[PDB]
Amino acid sequence: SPELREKHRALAEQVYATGQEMLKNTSNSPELREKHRALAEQVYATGQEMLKSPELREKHRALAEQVYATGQEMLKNTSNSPELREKHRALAEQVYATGQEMLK
Ligand code: HEM
Ligand code: HEM
C-alpha cells in the first residue's frame, strides 16, 4: 500500500514535469510526448491498483479518466489547438489538487 502510493506520487510528479515542459512548446518531440503518455499510463494503473473519503477518491478517479480521454484525442494530432491543451491542463490541475487533498 505505502510503496504503491509513493510509486503513484513519483509517477504523477514526472507526468506534471513532462507536461509543464511541453506546455512551453508549440511542438514537442515524439520522444517527450510518448514519455509523458507512458508515465500517464503507469500513474493510471498504480491508482487503480490502490483500490484493490470514498467521495474524494470517486471525484479524483472520475477526473483522472477525463484527463486521460482528452489525452487520447491529442494523440491523433501532430499539433494540438491551445483550447484542447487548456481543457487538459485544467482537468489535470484538478486531479493533482484532489490527490494532495487526500494526504491531509
Ligand atoms: C491519472 C492521473 C492521476 C494523477 C495525476 C494522480 C495524482 C495523485 C497524487 C499527486 C496523489 C497524492 C499522492 C501522495 O502525495 O501521496 C494521489 C493520490 C491517490 N490517488 Fe491518484 N492520480 C491519478 C489517477 C488515479 C486514479 C485513476 C486513481 C484510482 C482510480 C487514483 C487513486 C489514488 C488514491 C487512492 C490516492 C490516495 C492514496 C492514499 O491515501 O494512500 N489515482 N494521486
Ligand atoms: C495526470 C495527468 C495527465 C495525464 C493522464 C496526461 C495524459 C496525456 C496523454 C495520454 C496525452 C497524449 C500524448 C500525446 O499527445 O502524444 C497527453 C498529451 C499532452 N499533455 Fe498530458 N496528461 C496529464 C497532465 C498534463 C499536464 C499537467 C500538462 C501540462 C502542464 C499536460 C500537457 C500535455 C500536452 C501539452 C499534451 C500534448 C502534447 C503535444 O501536442 O505536443 N499534461 N497527456
- Burial, 79: exposed, middle or buried (Cβ in 10 Å; 0-12, 13-18, 19+)? exposed
Q: Which residue has cell 510526448?
A: 33
Task: Domain of residue 89: give its range.
Answer: 2-52+54-101
Number of alpha helices (DSSP H) and beta strands (DSSP E) in the chain: 4, 0
38: Cβ below 6 Å to ligand 1? no
- Looking at the chain, after which residues does the C atom sit over 2.5 Å from the next written N, breaking the chain? 52
**101 is written with which cell numbers?**
487533498
Residue among 1, 3, 8 to mutate when testing ligand 1 (max atoms within 8 A of CB): 8
If one counts the domains in the chain, the total is 1
**Contact 61 CB / ligand 1 (< 6 Å):** yes
The CATH code of the domain that includes 22 is: 1.20.120
- Resolution, given in Å to one decimal, reads 1.9
All three cell numbers of 7: 510509486
What distance in angstroms lies between residue 52's CA and the mean position of ligand 2's atoms? 26
Which technique was the structure solved with, according to the deposited record? X-ray
Nearest-5° angle of CA 90, CA 93, CA 95? 110
